């Protein structure tokens, strides 16, 4: 066969398609159950992706249009530049709801050639454009509000975890997926007498693990639920340990920030937005 | 008639021609005649010029190539950006003999449209790209070494100015043009008894002025010469005043720095280099 029309066209004409990705990370810490207490640190990265064949298009059209883009709903941010060569901005006043960035083309081209030598059979080359910090409030900046309670008796430990799905922390209500709840139980732990929902006790590491596939307002509970466990200890009592949660999402940012293309030459095939938990702890 | 072929071509095809100008200013102060003493402050600006019709070419080809250029023999410099929007650089390490800069095209285009509305019948639009400070040594950074001597008697003043053309302060030996030597004479001043070379006494401002058209190694003296004057004072004696020199040059910088185009899309029709005296004083 021959190459497609899409690939032929892209490798010798027009205005190029690129893809943008905003990938954010929530770090959170809850203490007791008192709202804040809660401490939040939200990180982010903005990645631009260029289709394979772009190195041929740059070899057939050696003087490319300039890539110029604009992050919208800025100012919550606090950016670095993972690649200070290849990317720049104004730097001056003030802290508007918008910021403009522009790309060093000869660099972008050398960079893409390099990545293509390293990974020839990839569909997309990702280039890290921005790194950033969103900000930073209380319990209302966290997608999933945690609250943990122990009852540590001399030979039995009782665990309650209450979780609250939180729309206020995201731009558009999207599901939380592959939610994991991990909590170490010391003491003796001989038996997991009872549990709800089902969970897995891990003998070797002495911790209990819950896997909830999706949390949302479409989901069971309506997003607000409980996990309960009861252990029998040989030693005792247990010293409470911090709960570690993990989750991922796709469809929204936590920042709300977005991206516009400025010049001509380029267009956005896709803008992907996702966030995941980083260090997401809750303590007694 | 119709437009030229140059203008037709330029307004609808190819790779654009631009012009670069490095314009420097020497500020100097000599004291007594002891070498340094001498104090030097050399300033500069780098200007990019775009031919008229460029706004039509941008209207017929809306996605232009990126302008990316590189100042060579940098590091003597110490730059600001007169237009922090439209221009950027790496900012990181270190202080190499070379630096790369790249332009915000949507801005450059809005800027050029604006200038064209303001001055439609101009041949070239100048855009201030860089401002800078060269550095900064002693008498060997000055194109024209000055040395002034007075003999202030009770009723007659004697002036000697010695000047030394200096190749060491410039990249390529070029002439100094429209050299003016202005020095105030207080006291009474009734008569300019004698003078060499010819000069003009100014009654109203009480100062003597010499105009030497060109100073060079092709020039008389070989570049090293004297101005002498003798005055008759009614009052007396004269308090010596600082000598003010003015000059201009075309053909060289004082820095030595230069400019390369990086991407494709653009080419240099002309790179013009010139320097002129700013505040260029010499004291007794």
Swiss-Prot record, chains A, B:
Expression across tissues: Specifically expressed in brain.
GO biological process: clathrin-dependent endocytosis; energy homeostasis; positive regulation of feeding behavior; positive regulation of receptor-mediated endocytosis; response to dietary excess; synaptic vesicle endocytosis
The UniProt record lists the keyword Phosphoprotein: yes
Span of domain MHD: 15-283
TM segment ranges: none
Coiled-coil boundaries: none
Cellular localisation: Membrane, Clathrin-coated pit
Single GO term (MF): microtubule binding
GO annotations of cellular component type: AP-2 adaptor complex; clathrin-coated pit; clathrin-coated vesicle; cytoplasm; cytosol; plasma membrane; presynapse
Location of the region described as Necessary and sufficient to mediate interaction with CANX in the Swiss-Prot/TrEMBL record: 105-284
Interaction with DPF motifs-containing proteins: region residues: 17-23, 49-51, 123-126, 269-274
Keyword Membrane carried by entry: yes
Keywords: Coated pit, Endocytosis, Membrane, Phosphoprotein
Domain of life: Eukaryota
Function (record text): May function in clathrin-mediated endocytosis. Has both a membrane binding/tubulating activity and the ability to recruit proteins essential to the formation of functional clathrin-coated pits. Has a preference for membranes enriched in phosphatidylserine and phosphoinositides and is required for the endocytosis of the transferrin receptor. May also bind tubulin. May play a role in the regulation of energy homeostasis.
Record note on quaternary structure: Interacts with proteins essential or regulating the formation of functional clathrin-coated pits. Interacts with CANX. Interacts with AP2A1. Interacts with EPS15. Interacts with SH3GL3. Interacts with AMPH. Interacts with ITSN1 (via SH3 domains). Interacts with and REPS1.
Name assigned to this protein: SH3-containing GRB2-like protein 3-interacting protein 1
Record organism: Homo sapiens
């Amino acid at each position: 066969v021959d190459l497609g029309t899409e690939n032929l066209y892209f490798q010798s004409a027009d205005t190029l398609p690129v893809a943008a990705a905003f990938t954010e990370t929530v770090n959170a810490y809850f203490k007791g159950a008192d709202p804040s207490k809660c401490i939040v640190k939200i990180t982010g990265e903005m990645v631009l992706s260029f289709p394979a064949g772009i190195t041929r298009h740059f070899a057939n059209n050696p003087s490319p249009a300039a890539l110029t883009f604009r992050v919208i709903n800025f100012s919550r941010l606090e950016h670095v530049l993972p690649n200070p060569q290849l990317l720049c901005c104004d730097n001056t006043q003030n802290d508007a709801n918008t910021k403009e960035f522009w790309v060093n083309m000869p660099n972008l081209m050398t960079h893409l050639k390099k990545v293509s030598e390293q990974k020839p059979q990839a569909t997309y080359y990702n280039v890290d454009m921005l790194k950033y910090q969103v900000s930073a409030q209380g319990i209302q900046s966290t997608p999933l509000n945690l609250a943990v309670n122990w009852r540590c008796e001399p030979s039995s430990t009782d665990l309650r975890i209450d979780y609250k799905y939180n729309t206020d922390a995201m731009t558009t209500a999207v599901a939380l997926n592959n939610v994991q709840f991990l909590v170490p139980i010391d003491g003796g732990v001989t038996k997991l007498q009872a549990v709800l929902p089902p969970a897995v006790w891990n003998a070797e590491q002495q911790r209990i693990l819950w896997k909830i596939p999706d949390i949302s307002q479409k989901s069971e509970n309506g997003g607000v639920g409980s996990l309960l466990a009861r252990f029998q200890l040989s030693e005792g009592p247990s010293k409470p340990s911090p709960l570690v949660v993990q989750f991922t999402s796709e469809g929204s940012t936590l920042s709300g920030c977005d991206i516009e293309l400025v010049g001509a030459g380029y267009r956005f095939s896709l803008i992907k937005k996702r966030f995941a938990a980083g260090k997401y702890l809750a303590d007694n």
